[PDB]
Amino acid sequence: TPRTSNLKAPLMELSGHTGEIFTAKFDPTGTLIASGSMDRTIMLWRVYGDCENYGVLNGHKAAILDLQWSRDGDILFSASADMHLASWDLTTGQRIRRYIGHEEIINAMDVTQRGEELLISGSDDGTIGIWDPRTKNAVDYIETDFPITAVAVSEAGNEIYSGGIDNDIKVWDIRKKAVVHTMLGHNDTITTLRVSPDGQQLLSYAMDSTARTWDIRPFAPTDRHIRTFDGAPLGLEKNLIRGSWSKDGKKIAVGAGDGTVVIWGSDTGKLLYKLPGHKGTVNCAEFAPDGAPIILSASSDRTMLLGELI
Amino acid sequence: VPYTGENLARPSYGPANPFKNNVLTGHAEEMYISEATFRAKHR
């Protein structure tokens, strides 16, 4: 079993950023790659074939710290530490517009994959902004008393998964602008909240080097905590590590501060992989949304490793 | 890949010698971190 995929090599090292990569996301058809990095740039690659850097997007005045794709994969969504959001066009390589209204650094954002289009930005002033991707003004914003480093949209499109430095996952409702309930249990600062593809589990990695999976389902006990996977210690930097799910919801991949991306089995809690290959901390560990065994790990070695899981 | 996690999680058999760095004084490997983190810890 040498190689079972469509890449022309079992490993590919995408390089060309002059600064640390913080996020990298796949096109929801598993075909296009976008990586935003602290040199204020979004580099756009192909994943299948010779994998050329077909595009570069400039226009952010500070470090880029998130980006999601659209429904089709034609409009990119970049949050950046210049207190701004931005919607970008990939037909021309230009920028559609910028979204303004935050006062401090923006750490998270989320686009509603199905439902109605909303951008959800968590920002260090203590705010969760809900934006429509046609008008630059904020449709709404929810006020907290702590910085927000993590944000996810519910399957039903009205609950917001905030995670702050106050050490607990908070689920808010958009209509009442108030918290529904808090899954507490973490000890350190939350970094990523990614919903399961079927929609009943939530991944959450915090600065305490533990990644926990929680419940989403409306019928659940008082403690919604399913499991506390361990085995990915966090390094020297306090980066915002971004984990993800596989397509089948069976494998949990989270980067770690030793340059290794760690994959557990989400069903039982067994370390499936501990893949090395990076020098500094691994910031964004993602799966292929199509279901192929392709994994991507973008790390602050200014690099991305696109590899296989055979 | 050298399998998945089974051969990464096991010890090599046998006892050690009763009887690998690169620098004489120790071991040094290159790394990339943000310069602000280094400045913060230095300060």
Binding site: A9, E13, L44, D50, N53, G55 | -
Partner: peptide
């Protein structure tokens, strides 16, 4: 008007295995 950037793609290896 997507201009081609300075990125390159090189096959590589994941290096030495790391202890748990």
């Amino acid at each position: 008007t997507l201009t081609a950037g300075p990125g390159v793609a090189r096959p590589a290896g994941r290096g030495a295995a790391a202890p748990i």
